[PDB]
UniProtKB/Swiss-Prot annotation, chain A:
Keyword Phosphoprotein: yes
Encoding gene (name): EIF2B3
Example GO BP: T cell receptor signaling pathway
Keywords on record: Acetylation, Cytoplasm, Disease variant, Initiation factor, Leukodystrophy, Phosphoprotein, Protein biosynthesis
Name of the protein in its database record: Translation initiation factor eIF2B subunit gamma
Membership in a protein family: Belongs to the eIF-2B gamma/epsilon subunits family.
Modified-residue entries (N-acetylmethionine), positions: M1
Disease annotated for this entry: Leukoencephalopathy with vanishing white matter 3: An autosomal recessive brain disease characterized by neurological features including progressive cerebellar ataxia, spasticity, and cognitive deficits. Brain imaging shows abnormal white matter that vanishes over time and is replaced by cerebrospinal fluid. Disease severity ranges from fatal infantile forms to adult forms without neurological deterioration. The disease is progressive with, in most individuals, additional episodes of rapid deterioration following febrile infections or minor head trauma.
Record GO cellular component, one term: guanyl-nucleotide exchange factor complex
Summary of activators and inhibitors of this protein: Activated by the chemical integrated stress response (ISR) inhibitor ISRIB which stimulates guanine nucleotide exchange factor activity for both phosphorylated and unphosphorylated eIF2.
Main location: cytoplasm
Section of the entire sequence shown: 1 to 295 of 452
Curated annotation (Swiss-Prot), chain B:
Segment of the intact protein contained: 41 to 466 of 721
Outcome reported for the amino acid change (mutating R73H): In VWM5; with ovarian failure
Post-translational modification: Phosphorylated on serine and threonine residues by GSK3B; phosphorylation inhibits its function.
Gene that this polypeptide is encoded by: EIF2B5
Modified residues (Phosphothreonine): T282
Regulation of catalytic or functional activity: Activated by the chemical integrated stress response (ISR) inhibitor ISRIB which stimulates guanine nucleotide exchange factor activity for both phosphorylated and unphosphorylated eIF2.
Cellular component terms (Gene Ontology): cytoplasm; cytosol; eukaryotic translation initiation factor 2B complex; nucleus
Residues with the Phosphoserine modification: S90, S410, S426
Species name: Homo sapiens
Protein name: Translation initiation factor eIF2B subunit epsilon
Keywords of the record: Acetylation, Cytoplasm, Disease variant, Initiation factor, Isopeptide bond, Leukodystrophy, Methylation, Phosphoprotein, Protein biosynthesis, Ubl conjugation
Record function comment: Acts as a component of the translation initiation factor 2B (eIF2B) complex, which catalyzes the exchange of GDP for GTP on eukaryotic initiation factor 2 (eIF2) gamma subunit. Its guanine nucleotide exchange factor activity is repressed when bound to eIF2 complex phosphorylated on the alpha subunit, thereby limiting the amount of methionyl-initiator methionine tRNA available to the ribosome and consequently global translation is repressed.
Single GO MF annotation: translation initiation factor activity
Cellular localization per UniProt: Cytoplasm, Cytosol
Swiss-Prot record, chain C:
Domain called S1 motif: residue spans: 14-85
GO cellular component, one term: cytosol
The name this protein goes by in its record: Eukaryotic translation initiation factor 2 subunit 1
Alphabetical GO biological process terms: cellular response to amino acid starvation; cellular response to heat; cellular response to oxidative stress; cellular response to UV; HRI-mediated signaling; mitophagy; negative regulation of translational initiation in response to stress; PERK-mediated unfolded protein response
Gene name in the database record: EIF2S1
Organism expressing this protein natively: Homo sapiens
Curated annotation (Swiss-Prot), chain E:
Gene Ontology CC terms: cytoplasm; cytosol; eukaryotic translation initiation factor 2B complex
Full protein name: Translation initiation factor eIF2B subunit beta
Consequence the record notes for mutating E179G: In VWM2; with and without ovarian failure
General function of this protein: Acts as a component of the translation initiation factor 2B (eIF2B) complex, which catalyzes the exchange of GDP for GTP on eukaryotic initiation factor 2 (eIF2) gamma subunit. Its guanine nucleotide exchange factor activity is repressed when bound to eIF2 complex phosphorylated on the alpha subunit, thereby limiting the amount of methionyl-initiator methionine tRNA available to the ribosome and consequently global translation is repressed.
Family, as annotated: Belongs to the eIF-2B alpha/beta/delta subunits family.
Activity regulation, free text: Activated by the chemical integrated stress response (ISR) inhibitor ISRIB which stimulates guanine nucleotide exchange factor activity for both phosphorylated and unphosphorylated eIF2.
Location of the protein in the cell: Cytoplasm, Cytosol
Pfam families registered for this protein in UniProt: IF-2B
Top-level lineage group: Eukaryota
Amino acid sequence: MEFQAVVMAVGLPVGNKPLIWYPLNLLERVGFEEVIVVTTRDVQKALCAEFKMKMKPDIVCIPDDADMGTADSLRYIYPKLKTDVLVLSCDLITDVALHEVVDLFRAYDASLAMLMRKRDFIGVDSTGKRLLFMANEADLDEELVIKGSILQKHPRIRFHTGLVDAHLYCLKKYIVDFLMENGSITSIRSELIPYLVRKQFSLKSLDIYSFIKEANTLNLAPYDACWNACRGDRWEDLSR
Amino acid sequence: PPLQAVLVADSFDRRFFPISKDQPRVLLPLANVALIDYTLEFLTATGVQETFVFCCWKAAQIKEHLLKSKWCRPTSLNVVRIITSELYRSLGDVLRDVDAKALVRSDFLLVYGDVISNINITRALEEHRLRRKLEKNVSVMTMIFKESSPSHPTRCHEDNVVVAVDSTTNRVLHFQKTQGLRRFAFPLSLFQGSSDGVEVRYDLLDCHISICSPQVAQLFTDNFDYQTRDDFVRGLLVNEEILGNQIHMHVTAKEYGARVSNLHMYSAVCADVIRRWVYPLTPEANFTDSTTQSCTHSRHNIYRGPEVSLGHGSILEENVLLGSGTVIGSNCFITNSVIGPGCHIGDNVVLDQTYLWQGVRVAAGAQIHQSLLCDNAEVKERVTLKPRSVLTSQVVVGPNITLPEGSVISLHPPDAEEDEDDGEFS
Amino acid sequence: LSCRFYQHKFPEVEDVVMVNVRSIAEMGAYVSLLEYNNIEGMILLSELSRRRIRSINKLIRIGRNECVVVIRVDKEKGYIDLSKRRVSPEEAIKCEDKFTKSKTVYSILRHVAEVLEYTKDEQLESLFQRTAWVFDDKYKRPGYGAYDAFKHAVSDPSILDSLDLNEDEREVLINNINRRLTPQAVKIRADIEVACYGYEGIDAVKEALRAGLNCSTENMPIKINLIAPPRYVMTTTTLERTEGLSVLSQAMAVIKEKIEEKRGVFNVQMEPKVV
Amino acid sequence: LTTLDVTKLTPLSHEVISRQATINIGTIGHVAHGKSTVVKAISGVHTVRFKNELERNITIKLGYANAKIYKLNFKLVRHVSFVDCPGHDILMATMLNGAAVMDAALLLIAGNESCPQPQTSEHLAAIEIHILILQNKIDLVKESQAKEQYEQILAFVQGTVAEGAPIIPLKYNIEVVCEYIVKKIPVPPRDFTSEPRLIVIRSFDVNKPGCEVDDLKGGVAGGSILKGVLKVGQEIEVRPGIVSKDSEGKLMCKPIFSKIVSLFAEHNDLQYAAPGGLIGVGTKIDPTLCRADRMVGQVLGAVGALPEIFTELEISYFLLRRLLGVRTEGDKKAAKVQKLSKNEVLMVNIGSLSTGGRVSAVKADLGKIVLTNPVCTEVGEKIALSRRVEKHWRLIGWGQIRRGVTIKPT
Amino acid sequence: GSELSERIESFVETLKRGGGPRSSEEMARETLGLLRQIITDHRWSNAGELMELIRREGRRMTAAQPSETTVGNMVRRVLKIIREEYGRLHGYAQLQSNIIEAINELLVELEGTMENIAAQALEHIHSNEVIMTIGFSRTVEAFLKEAARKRKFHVIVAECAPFCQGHEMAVNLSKAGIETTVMTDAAIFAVMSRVNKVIIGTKTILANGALRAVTGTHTLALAAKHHSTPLIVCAPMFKLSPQFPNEEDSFHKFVAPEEVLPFTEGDILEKVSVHCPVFDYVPPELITLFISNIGGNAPSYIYRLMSELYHPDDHVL
């Protein structure tokens, strides 16, 4: 089997419907006969009993610890994964056709392929699919720096400002092998993105790809995007 | 409205030394035609009705050179204005002199005197006039770049230019060079000021054909510290809420445009001219109507002049131009080279990537690679030249004297590496 | 609804007429005489040029109007022989101008009859004979006389009062003439850069502007306006633009002389041209 | 309405007959676009509007704002010209370049904190010089404003060593500050018997686009009068004039004499014009000779001023070690004025004439700055020297003019 | 006077810089108007003095652009017209108006060329036919777009690699509904097995029946000779030139190599030699039929039109 979908829960079903139901339904629509779901334990370690009350074909719910991250979540399920990893989240309701990111993962044999939908400044090549840079001022002392080798190999890099991460990744086996071999990573969204973006700027190397959609948008953990979730689910869940 | 232009016929950098101590850089010929003739032909084919030529150093020689040309004839549609002064020493001095004289009216071109191009910029001036009519004279300068890979030998490391612009409205937000910089630093207020789109561009070769509004001369009159063009854009981009003046940009992909400031830029632009990259401006077309410069185009870009008198065994394979009256001996091997008019070549010689000007005299057995020989030169037998050698204004090289890679020999002792004679040893 | 252009139904001998080619045959080129109610003529194959002609279609151009000289005419047989070889370029330009003036008069009387709603061709021909052919027979000039009388009636309508057609037909003809042939309107604009970098600079500039405005003739006021600080626009909205350009050039020369008398430069940014 | 006339023999600075321009009150503080709002609250928002154009030199030109402070159907005696220049270094270089400039300095202080902008303002006020401190941070808590006023009085106690004895902690506070300025600032001595010298700061064109042939107003210049009295009808003398380099060499400066047709201030001014305000003169000049800020930097004399157009001035180079009051938290060799290198641009502010000049030669006590445009102030006047540190012209030194090369064409 | 030399120099640097105007019939009308302006603005006693004059300015106008032959053959045709009038008047003062009316006859001959080819166009097209053309020419597209008014057939417009101008011909013929097929230039012998006849244009007909045309059409002529399909050269008679092919090697017009290999290719542009000839040479043995406004002619008949329109004493110009 090509993919093993992993759904993260780090601080949940507060809305017109369950927040866990939309990612699982999206997964169970196109394939994904077995789904590994990670339960939450930071806010309350009792949502897994709320996770086993759905009507899906097959779910794998595991208990987790309170103080844990997404990189620790992937390092926790390392002896039970044997193929590529397709990471998800709970608060992510997307009307985007999922097969674009998987087509970019298969067609170019990328090492990581991600999906964004219109803070974090990203630079993607003129083809629009392969990313080259991403940074925020949370960890930047200086304003912005660009490596010289990526300007010698890619002379024009289109930057984007309003793009937010929908947290839909496509990891390979050796990426999770290096993540398990390097226990200093705690948040995989800031670790697997920036370290692989730096290591791709080396010939024989790795490929990172991204799809910028223009159909819908994801949500957030806070109450800033909790008002549009019901308006999205009232007009987008009728077709699903 | 008419089309004015400012031509800086004296680039004030000390780069063509001591070649510039004989004859200014804009009078040096690529293929038997000086650079100011190329720039005036580009301006006349653009649609410029009036130019303003500015000359500081060796200006009388430039004046007597261009007075017998095609553009100062009464039949010329492009009238020139020869303006010289011994006081100005920079491009900002030229533009503040223009502002003090009030020559231009609106939407005038600004170009150097050593710019090789064939771009018709009517689309760029349409966009500039539309932006000036829309934003009520807010956008001032419209720079012009050419799309080029950064690995090309035209753009050298001294003037590789990286910009950060908008892809939607083509406005310039950041501008810098790569003069000894491995990691490039970009500001962050350009992203907050324009949240609709932004792009970085390293694929842009600078042509220095920046068409301007007369507010450029206004800002050059105000800011006395702005000495040249990149000083002006680097002072204009960092100060945005004071003296707003957003510079816009045009990118050319189907036409050629460049300038010269090295031996590398000279060699690359000359190799592009011989390989017809600046068509229609080709040496066999004779855009400057002179009988001493007309050529015929053979196969493999071989340009042959009149009365050449080739010998037996002399082979010309690729990119060879032969001027008027240059005699060539037997068993020669010439490739990728420009030969001037009235030269004398010996026997059993090789000449690759070389630029022989007029009046030179090459003896037998000489092997010349990637060099430059200026006017009235001479070289004896049993000499072999190395790449990046410069011979300047009748320097004689004696027998059994091989020059190293770094070699510039002229009549002036401290500006060149040495001064030669009938014997090369001192 | 159509008629001929002149009082004669057939052209005279050696009279250059304007025709349009309708078809090409072996005997010649069939044409239609546009100024004689589209009667059929023939340009001969021997008369199409002075050079040996292999084929008729090389110089016929069916659909194009051309001036041809009449060689032979027969009112009984209905044969009209025409020739393009005999006509000169000066005679061709004369025939083109005559056909243009006669077509303008035909369009004016056609508009007058359309305003009068005369659907019958005989009443329209009587209107033709009462308006244009009477002047053409009085001045002994077909086409030139009627157009000259209409150009005089557009200015002074006493010539139109002599026509005894009707009470409303003469007024409709005068209105059609004043709407069709009286477009006397032109604007000769020019730009002049007159200044004086001296003691009384603005005073000498105002004196030169007053001297240029004082040289404006009657029914042709040279209006000066400050288009720029160093440049000025001297417009002139009047008819007879060949004289208006000369008046603007004389005013510009007077302004240049008044500027040079007070030690001031006077450049011509633009010559006298119609707007 | 005013009742001035052309009958005057020896006017005074505090004369109530003029009521147009009596004294000038400079302002240099920690504003960051806050002093223009204070001057509009003190005088008027749309009060100063005579002839506008495109903003050419925003940070290089100083803006004057007249204020007729009345007392008691009120009675007006003296008016104050609020000089609010963009950038405190431009006002410091203009005040420390001679005499009769920035007579009443106003320290626009803020009751928020004690940041380094107030330290730079205090350094500029000490380098310029009667100070007038005024807290602009209105609408604060009582204990917070008390602690901020205690901190400001502790900062001004160190200011009291040089000049630190004003005291002022929204319209009532502005009226109290105007009353304190009318009661505290004395009448400065101005020379009215000398020849009128109008240093132009901003020129405008009064002729609109597409105007009439006879209704043509040309050369509405604007500036400041250094000393003397200018009357209508007197032939002004532009000492810089038209600088032309048509001889292919050294440029000649032809002085254009123009009859003063009117002296038009922000209000309807009379024929006589005194110093201490933005004097606007509409003379008999051409529109091309006086374009939008084209005739700036020209000393419009009246009786043939002795100052000739100098092309290269050799002055005494005396540069400071660090910047006056500019010291951030880092200070990584930023406040360090370097030596006068060859071919370096310097903004010499001789009084009101801010001209650029290249450092051609200097030997350890005197730099021979070759000016770009012709300047004519004096033969031994105190000439300043500025340098753009980071996108802003800041003062670097002062000196006295030791030698020059004059040129006067005709 | 002076305005004559103004217009002459404007025409000369217009030919030197680019293609002004775009198509050739306007250029021939400009050349004939310039020649009538030259003969109406001068003074001469003998016809030979005007002959030497016209030879000198013809040398100048073909030295402006040696690749474009329309101005040169128009100068040569005017020279033969002057020679014929001097010969018919020799066996004096009425010569000038005779050359004026002869130039007017040549203008009426020249304005009705494409529509005469269109009038004789129905004699070469049958129903359900496969036509292959190359390049872009308004004569051939007008030919096909009026021949489709009564017949229904197929036209395969093949693009040319330097400037794909056949896309304009494809979208101009597809508006008339001729079932246009668009292909590249590399599939000609791949589609020569089904093309019944080849109807192309040209730039210049040479004296021996050979022709220069848009590049890649010598390959098309070779494939059509291999498949024995007839070639239709819809060409007017102002593209008829006496210039022989082997003459000082000034045949091809080379343009900038940007359209073949762009400037963004890399550092490999230094060690490469890119040529872009926009014209190509077709011998008369690979041509079946020429179609001019006077009718259809053989390539074994171009010498008679040469001797009927041009003089052998004016071949050097």
